[PDB]
């Protein structure tokens, strides 16, 4: 709990490491949860934008009080935490899929064997 700067070093990070990670947790969190809204057995991309401009397509519930849903890039550390605190509460309703969206199956990757 001391003032410092960011850089390549956990010792320096601290406040960043917390955010960096959180960002991942939140992101994945939504991605994962979202899957349910798509009955997907994996975390899918969460178009916060679309949901923003209009949830109609994909909705988001469980959100905490006095907290707005959005990408973890804008959300703050504390912000993320909350969401996480309600990770179990988080929810996503797919009223209507996007014009091109896809469900079921898996994307195309290529880590090694693929």
């Amino acid at each position: 709990g001391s003032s410092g700067s960011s850089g390549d070093d956990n010792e320096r990070l601290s406040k960043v490491e917390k955010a960096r990670q959180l960002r991942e947790q939140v992101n994945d969190l939504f991605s994962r949860k979202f899957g349910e809204a798509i009955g997907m057995g994996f975390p899918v991309k969460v178009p916060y934008r679309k949901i923003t401009i209009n949830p109609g397509c994909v909705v988001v519930d469980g959100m905490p009080p006095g907290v707005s849903f959005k990408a973890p890039s804008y959300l703050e550390i504390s912000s993320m935490r909350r969401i996480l605190d309600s990770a179990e509460f988080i929810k996503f309703t797919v009223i209507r899929p996007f014009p091109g969206l896809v469900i079921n199956n898996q994307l195309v990757s290529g880590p090694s064997s693929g």
Side-chain angles (χ1 to χ4, degrees):
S2 268
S3 295
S5 257
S6 186
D8 212 34
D9 241 320
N10 182 336
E11 248 196 302
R12 290 277 201 277
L13 296 166
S14 199
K15 192 257 211 143
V16 188
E17 253 253 327
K18 258 281 273 266
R20 238 192 189 184
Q21 289 197 8
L22 283 170
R23 282 221 280 284
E24 312 218 285
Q25 269 200 236
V26 173
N27 177 99
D28 224 292
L29 155 68
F30 288 139
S31 328
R32 243 162 202 275
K33 291 281 173 206
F34 174 50
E36 311 205 277
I38 42 187
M40 295 284 236
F42 43 60
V44 189
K45 73 159 146 274
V46 176
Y48 303 110
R49 180 106 181 160
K50 299 220 82 119
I51 276 128
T52 246
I53 56 192
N54 74 82
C57 305
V58 163
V59 182
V60 170
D61 272 56
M63 264 253 131
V67 174
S68 3
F69 169 68
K70 59 193 64 262
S73 50
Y74 304 148
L75 296 175
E76 287 199 31
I77 299 201
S78 50
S79 295
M80 294 188 261
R81 246 117 97 65
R82 296 164 130 178
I83 291 131
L84 301 170
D85 208 276
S86 262
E88 66 188 83
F89 265 125
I90 304 321
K91 202 177 131 127
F92 280 70
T93 298
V94 171
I95 289 62
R96 48 208 267 167
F98 321 122
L101 190 69
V102 178
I103 299 198
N104 198 81
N105 301 129
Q106 27 186 346
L107 234 134
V108 17
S109 57
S112 61
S113 186

